Symmetry: T
Subunit: 170 residues, 12 copies
């Protein structure tokens, strides 16, 4: 395993988590009205769990001998996802499209890390897998709200519960 | 009191509870989209409480000298309600119609048992009454969602709380 | 309703509960060996719940204008059940026979009170019913251990939980 | 069962509970001095439980197809008890007389509802019974403080515990 | 500071809180259907917190040497807000208009008290401020639901949490 | 150490605890009126802790090879204290005299056991000491209420807390 | 990975879990007598955890685009294990044979799913693995009771704890 | 703001809190008899909260660059209140007079600090205000017990709860 | 009050909180060795509380009609503090200098907002004050570690406790 | 008191506790079958409490200026009990004989230490006594299971509760 | 036993505890810098437990018929230890010397009381012993920090836990 | 997979865990002085988690048909790590070298087991992985303390939390 290549993937993943924390704050605040009320708590669940993903990734980056970029702006520029900007027409439907697109990219990011580490870096693989569980659930929440695809998921107990990644959290 | 007749009523009631647990799982998974989100947690509350009703009925059936049928398929065939099948056109409105119909039949089932045991089998009456409380509440939830009849009910604290039947639960 | 007659029934019921608390202590201590270990916790559950039944009955006796006898020996003499003496040959089998006989008498006592108060003294009826729930469960525990009659009961959560009478307990 | 007649009884009962919440606030504040300190917590227990009784009655009124009056002043005028006014000479003794009189009327109100619904409306009967338990206890508290009639009651665990009606509370 | 003038403001504020508790009960019960489900829990949060505001105001009124009116009808007549009557056409939209209007008046009431007590009665100011926090949040909830104005608020943890006024509550 | 003599002391102590549980129930119920309210919770604390003392003593009696008497009436006759009968004139003052006398005898009983076992039976000594702590506190509560002797004791946290003997309780 | 083939395996696994919930209820009720008491709590632990396995499998089936069968009888017919029927001679020994056989088949089912998904569907693999942990423990419990094979397992904390699959449970 | 002058006020306030902790211990121990029992818990509430006030003041004194006096006797001499000595005739009435006088002086002390810091030292003002809340409540408790002035206050939940100053406590 | 000017201050304050969350993560990771261990938990306390400050500020910004910047890089550029960069020579001493400088700037920021809103915007003032409490404590922690100035502060209970701002947090 | 002699006793006691932790693990794993199930939880209770005894003894050994042996094999050789080897014929009966013999030796060990320290080293005596309580209970559990001697003991609440020695545990 | 002599010892012990509470506050505030951070929490643990020791001693002093001195300055003058003054050169090393000296004197004080009461006043002996446990632990903490003597002690769970004396605390 | 070879690896791993529990006890006791205080809690965290690793490994060894060695000395001789002896010069620096060396060997041990079981024994692999998580964290703690390598780890919540292996613990 090329640790420099792995470190680059993890730092880019961490940057996506960190910026998602910011951009979902804005998206949550614009989920207004009666139909917005249907999704506000779901955005908040995802936002807090993505903050937890950042918290879980940083110790592994340092364990592997990497470091966060010195400047926060360089960090944000590294995000492996496009910024989840508020849509120009911020209807509930357009907000859900942004959320679903962001979550699908996240699922891709951790699938890539899992594929790269499978049978080589077991701790990193297990961390990538734990986050992948939560991203697949996030994607399911938003795909159900937007397209009506059936799913067997509920809201979390508490927001930010992170049932899969909590074993990595302090 | 004819204990064989009473045992038949209780086993048929238990079969309705057990199959409801299965069929509400399907109905919950199809409560999708923005308007589905309004009812998903309510279906889940009812589903878990109906599972509790099955758990509460089985000890009384054995106390009275009855037994569950040997085969699960014979048990399901005994249910005193029609199966709450997913509608052919599974809109939220059609799903609510199935739920309301199932809950109205349940209210009828336990009203029948209460009438049969009133002043004769106090333990069985009190158990039937406890379940009846929860079925009347279930019926109220779905009638409010579907027809707009005013009601003073909320969601449970936790799903499956069963405030009335919990004294019968282990 | 003849309140003096009702008071006599309740005081005799309370005396049976109180003495059961003493006699089950002895029976529990003699449930020894490997097969005794199977029943020790079940005796302890019943003993603590019967202590709770005494605690629940005393406020109702005073509400109705009755009182406990001045001397504890007169109280014990009033018990509506025979004393659950340790058997002369205190095998596990003989101990279970004593327990089952005591619980069957208790079920009879509260059935009598429920029949007397049904549709006349609702508070007393509901208290008698709550205790009756627990006595029917106690009888079921011991009949299952002794005769092998199937039952759907477990051990309590905690000993002395009294799920049915706790609403009457301080 | 005449549902209109039953609805009238329940709404009048609810009005008595609601106004009691207000009037007991005043009575509690005037239970001053060293002897007032003996009863302040008891008034507060009763006040909070009577607020719970209002909360428990409203869902049943709507379940039965009734509604609260449009104006709060019309609601207060419906109370099935006389207003528990602060006495002109607000000594502790006179305050206890007001409390005892109010609680005796409450016991009468729910006894009437239980008698009307016994064996006809099991859910309403069980709700009336649950409240009746707490009113009989309230009456016992104040009769003991005022007349010295022995009783086996304590203060609640927490104020407003409502051990009997909590299964009806959200 | 004119304590009589301040007492009048606080009693009128308390009357508005108390009647809001009644009128929001009715409004909550009429938030029916799928779109009603979006707001029912929000009305219930506000209703329970406004009940807490009444509870917080009464001790301060008595500390300052005031008292509640002898009759509940005189109390209700003092409310510094118009009664939040159910609209003649009780659609969700019309119900939200009533709620928003009531909350805007409440914000005005406590702003007036804060302005009157600022730098003069620190305890009263801090109490008025604590309630003002919760009224501004209530207004934000309903303005977001009705007009779509963005906001960063969620549902409470538990209904009636009152995070700002709880330090004044017993 | 003469184990037969020690067993006799412990069984007589256990009998005093058990009968105290009964007699304090009566005394608590007669602590009525405004001045009775001052002592009711204190009697209840002592009553529940004396029940705990019985529970703590029985395992040690069996560990030492003793046993409870076969009949409850023989057990009661063994009590090392006089029965705490309700006074012929059951004023609060006379009730306190009975309580204080009973607690002073209890302090004597466990002082005797501690003296007999000191430096000989460490487990029994430590159990006697633990109960002695609670009896000295019980005596202090009642001597303060009756004679006005200053003391630094409060009510327990919860009734029956038994802070000293709980390590011996199951 | 052939998702249709995987969906078939998961639905058959879910059907086995669901029917096990029913059949273990019967088996638990027939674990009577003194030797039955040794296994009743162990059956109940397994029964509740197998109910949890059904709950964990359903969301994954829907995530993968599958669905539960429309009719409960078709679902039961799909179970990848033979029905755990009560034996014709329902001795404790024969009941244990049924339990052990059912658990060994379950271990086989999830081993098959793990083998099929290893390095291909990480979320499904991890879910299959979590259930496999609990089935291997279930098999160990019953093999120890029946054959005396040493094992280092205890009862769960609470029944239905599901320590391995709880991260998948709502 | 003259920080030396402010430091002098805060140290004198801290000294009053610290000595109150000692002197209320004595006063609590002399609140004996039946009427003493009415006030013992109230003294204990005030005593523990005044200990909390000392704990809250010390960090602010050090933040502002002050320090506690080197010797405890010099500290005690600085107290901004007269020592709450046990009265020469320590009746309950005379003890209440001492308590009320001490609490009125405390209210004055923190009113002075609030006036001095208003709009100048916001952290110190908020701390002074938090303590002032609790002193006004303490004064209300004792004025109600002594003079019979109506008040809307209860006992704390737990003694030493300090609902207003707890945010300053570690 | 100029709401546009106030909104600018609050958004700049929020940006400082958000970037502090990032930069303190880096600083915490470089507090290594035996002397680093002394400060790691203190940095983590401050970091989590500053994250809470961001969470508390965002709802107020939206209440006042402001919004977060569309892009995260524009947000970071608005921070009213200089970025707390890791020092070129990252000794513990140099890290503490960065922390102290950042906290002193934060104290200045909220002092400015409090001065601007005092007696004009009570909700905003109270929020600014709550954050100011925590910043003054943060400054005290680091000044004590670096310069040895005495202070009366401890570590928090849990990291991120935010005792002063929690009433603003969801 | 000869501290070197005392240190030798305590280190030998600690070695017996430590090795018991290992050997009871093996014995627990061989308590198989239906009759093994009766004792498995009892062995586990004793094993965890003996681990606690080791934890409690080590601080006292260091307080007294002693130390653990450098090598674990020398430590094990010091154990004041014979190793509790699995019997050559590991029936439940033979396993109980090993357990009872080990516990009787433990009771002897702490009786010796108590006798040596009585009235000389109060801290050490109290620690020896606390452990002695638990060893006498352990001996009672196994003597009851093996010989049928009556006893008044139950299982612990949780395994490893150590009610007597917990005050010495961190 | 000479109770006057014993009372003098206990009052002097209580005075030492009370003044230690004050003087350790100062010492804690001067444990600054990186090496001060190592001991601040340990001083705080000892300070809060010594406050608990004062609370535990006062009830026993009153039980024995003693009383606290009328004036706090006379109380402080009675302390059986020298005042733990801040050193003229308040380095961490010099502060530890003061702490160790104070704790060694405390160990001496309670050793004296234990020796005086051994086999004469069991309640007082047990209280002295409980405090002695905690003083020996306090001495161990500071001797380890100062001289490097090995010890097996940790920080408490929570500060002021007082595991040995809590049974004496309200 | 060669189960005999796997059993040998697991037993050797278990022996290393068990002896680490002993040797870290000694190392913790010698982490004295001001710089020792920095690491004492970290050693204790690792020690308790390594005890948990032993507890987690034993059930798997028995599941696979292995057994612990009959004698504890043979078990200790099997440890796959060298004994973590106290250094001849037990400075903090030398103690950290021993700890780091022991943890690096542990990381190697579980890496070997994971490599051997990957894709062959999923339950054993997952157990080895869970322990590997905790060993990598242990190694990180000590490498940071000794060499100053940056890391993102904290102390555990509670000592012995074992967040990764707890799902395997009873
Ligand atoms: Fe919706
Ligand atoms: Fe058994
Ligand atoms: Fe009183
Ligand atoms: Fe009183
Ligand atoms: Fe009183
Ligand atoms: Fe350090
Ligand atoms: Fe068994
Ligand atoms: Fe340090």
């Amino acid at each position: 395993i090329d640790v420099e290549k792995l470190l680059e993937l993890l730092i880019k993943a961490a940057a996506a988590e960190f910026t998602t924390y910011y951009y979902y704050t804005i998206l949550r605040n614009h989920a207004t009205g009666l139909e917005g009320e249907a999704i506000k708590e779901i955005i908040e669940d995802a936002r807090l769990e993505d903050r937890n993903h950042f918290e879980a990734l940083v110790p592994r980056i340092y364990e592997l001998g990497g470091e966060l970029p010195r400047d926060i702006r360089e960090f944000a520029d590294l995000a492996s996802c496009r910024d989840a900007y508020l849509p120009e027409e911020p209807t509930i439907e357009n907000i859900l499209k942004v959320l679903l697109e962001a979550e699908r990219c996240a699922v891709g990011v951790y699938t890539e890390i899992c594929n790269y580490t499978f049978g080589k870096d077991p701790r990193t693989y297990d961390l990538a897998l734990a986050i992948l569980h939560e991203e697949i659930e996030h994607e399911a929440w938003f795909e159900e709200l937007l397209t009506g695809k059936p799913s067997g998921h509920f809201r979390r107990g508490k927001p930010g519960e992170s049932p899969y990644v909590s074993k990595f959290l302090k």
